[PDB]
Amino acid sequence: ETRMVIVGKISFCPKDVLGHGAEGTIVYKGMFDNRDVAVKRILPECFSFADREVQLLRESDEHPNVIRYFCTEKDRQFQYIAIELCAATLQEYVEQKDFAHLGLEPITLLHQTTSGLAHLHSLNIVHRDLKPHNILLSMPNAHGRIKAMISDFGLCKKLVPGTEGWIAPEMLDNPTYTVDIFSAGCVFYYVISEGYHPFGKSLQRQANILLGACNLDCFHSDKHEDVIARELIEKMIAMDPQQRPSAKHVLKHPFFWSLEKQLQFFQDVSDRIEKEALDGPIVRQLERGGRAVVKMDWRENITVPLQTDLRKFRTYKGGSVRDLLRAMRNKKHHYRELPVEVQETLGSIPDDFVRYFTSRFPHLLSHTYQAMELCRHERLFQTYYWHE
Amino acid sequence: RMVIVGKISFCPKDVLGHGAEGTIVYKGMFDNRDVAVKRILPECFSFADREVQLLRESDEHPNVIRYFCTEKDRQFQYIAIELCAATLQEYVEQKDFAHLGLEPITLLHQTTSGLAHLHSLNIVHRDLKPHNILLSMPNAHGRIKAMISDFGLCKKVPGTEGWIAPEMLSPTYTVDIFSAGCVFYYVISEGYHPFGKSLQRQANILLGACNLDCFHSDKHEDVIARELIEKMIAMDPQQRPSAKHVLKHPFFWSLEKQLQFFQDVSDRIEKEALDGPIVRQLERGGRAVVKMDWRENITVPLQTDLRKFRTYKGGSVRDLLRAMRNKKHHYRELPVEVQETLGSIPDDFVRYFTSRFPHLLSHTYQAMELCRHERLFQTYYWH
Ligand SMILES: Nc1ncnc2c1ncn2[C@@H]1O[C@H](COP(=O)(O)OP(=O)(O)O)[C@@H](O)[C@H]1O
């Protein structure tokens, strides 16, 4: 009637449905040792479990962003999987007007997703089906902190994977991390714009994925974060799979950087450029985009107090990017000995100081990161770039 | 080396921090739940058992902390209260605190409504401050909350250097309200005191020196806060607003509530003459807030589209208000280009305007008091 289903260890009352999956799949709320879990029952005729991959996940350290499959058991006609019981899917996070994000903010969230995914790829495993619904939010712990974990991995298909809208194009063989990095890109933009898809509406989505149409209409060219984000997503959702950035690669990116990390970068650059010829390849590179970034003369687009105190020292070109970079490194390093007025059109440090400049020079950070490869090694830049 | 005095019991070692005048506060146990207990010298503070009983005979308030029980030993007094996680001090000051969680405005709303609970019963706090405002522990499912504390006791001058109302040096609800203002600015400024450093604080309070240096005038929200804060902390006791009076203020309004007002006005002003006091009043500050002509300070599609009708001035606040009430009420029929520069609604649509007209909301709220008593405006105003 409405009697409980065992197939122990797993157990669940069949009225406790959490939601339907694709091909006659269903997910209920159940029980395990005695802790709650969610049990998902897949028709062995529709989906194919990859037990070896998981046996591989267990015998390698746990990642806090890749969900745990507790056990699995078979009844005569069904496959039952017990997994960490979660509270919601990205979908609600983004789209539920009143969802209570709690602690975590979109960028950390994406940092978590991408980190977990990177771990999966570290074990030569490809998810093949990322999307808001396969990226889940934990319930709150004792300390109340909530996190995010990717799911429904290693759970393939028999008699094409993925979901209309999120399918890397080149899948229309044995896939490769490039696919998942496409799906990632989409979710990234989905989260940031607060619901919009880059491709960009249910019905046209896959068609437009095939054609290569993007939108990205939310990313303006005058905002620092919009620029740094677009620079990445545009590259993740790239039509050419061999252009899509590696997993860890996406993790070093400027996009995730603290304000402190940002400003710290800005400086660390400057300290190289002194004692480097301007005819030189490095500075010539840093000045290629030049004027556009600096708005012709950067002195004309900052505060009057700051141009006065700078004035008192000259040796700041103003159409020059490098001079804008040391100008920062100095106004910063001598910060304590500054006039007060000047201390307060910026300040304090690092957050307000950096934001001053990136607010005025949206293309600054992006441009500077892109310029300052060539120092992929240096022994020192390994914190901002990846050398391998 | 455990200490009983049941039903309260605590380890003397589990200390949570020293309070005033010799007070010490430990982590103990009550029924079998964890609690905080504080031991006071009966000789230095005076508990008020009548006040607490009264609060206890009354419906709980979620933002006013609970006293479970109290017990005297030969030489001390011990008090058992809900065990909280930290004070407003840490919330503001601790670079990595995990907030987690909850926004400053609802935080101050919470503190205020509790306060108003206290004043509902004719009971005044007298020593409000960050250290006397606590953050609950994460609950069953991870939501944090803020409650006031250390009330109902006294001293055998009340308050703390930095937070005492001016007239208490040389009481009524006005005193708390001042301390409240102080905290509001402390919290919004992320650390700064209005008066505004430990030593010059009380002095300056007597003198009247403020700062509010963090409130620009070009930001809708700063203008809103400042306009209220400055009034909480006002030198004159008769000027400081009622407790729940402060709960009705725009400072706490949702985007949607802000917008609903904007509109709820236009629908009032319309179909009345300009000789009428109301309109003439609304344009008192006029040109400056609309920026001479607001038509020149809005987005391009929107003027292009608002060209097609006007009949719209640009030196008229009422015409900018009407504008919002039309462009919103027809949002559906707008040209997509236009629908896209604002929207969705209410949030993005109301910020379109308040981003560019910082004094717009403030200005209108003031002018429109004239209709304080009307059925439609009680949700916005106080009596
Ligand atoms: N760990 C979980 N906790 C709660 N609900 C879940 C969990 N995992 C999956 N679900 C629910 O089941 C629905 C569909 O199941 P499934 O086939 O696993 O995913 P999808 O919808 O991604 O294809 C999901 O949208 C989700 O609401």
Ligand SMILES: Nc1ncnc2c1ncn2[C@@H]1O[C@H](COP(=O)(O)OP(=O)(O)O)[C@@H](O)[C@H]1O
């Ligand atoms: N309910 C409580 N839970 C946990 N700690 C508390 C509680 N009440 C007070 N404290 C701690 O006690 C310390 C001071 O004791 P108290 O009597 O409040 O003096 P003060 O008024 O300076 O806070 C505070 O710093 C706070 O950490």
Ligand SMILES: *Cc1c(O)c(OC)cc2c(C)c(CCOCCOC)c(=O)oc12
């Ligand atoms: C603004 C500024 C710049 O740009 C700079 O460039 C190297 C240096 C300094 C220094 C060293 C100080 C410290 C005070 O030195 C004063 C003596 O100068 C004649 C500063 O305040 O600002 C800069």
Ligand SMILES: *Cc1c(O)c(OC)cc2c(C)c(CCOCCOC)c(=O)oc12
């Ligand atoms: C923008 C706008 C304004 O300002 C306005 O003020 C009177 C009215 C309208 C209306 C009525 C509509 C609906 C479309 O009407 C076109 C003419 O037919 C009545 C609108 O889209 O925008 C405004």
Ligand SMILES: [Mg+2]
């Ligand atoms: Mg799923």
Ligand SMILES: [Mg+2]
């Ligand atoms: Mg206290």
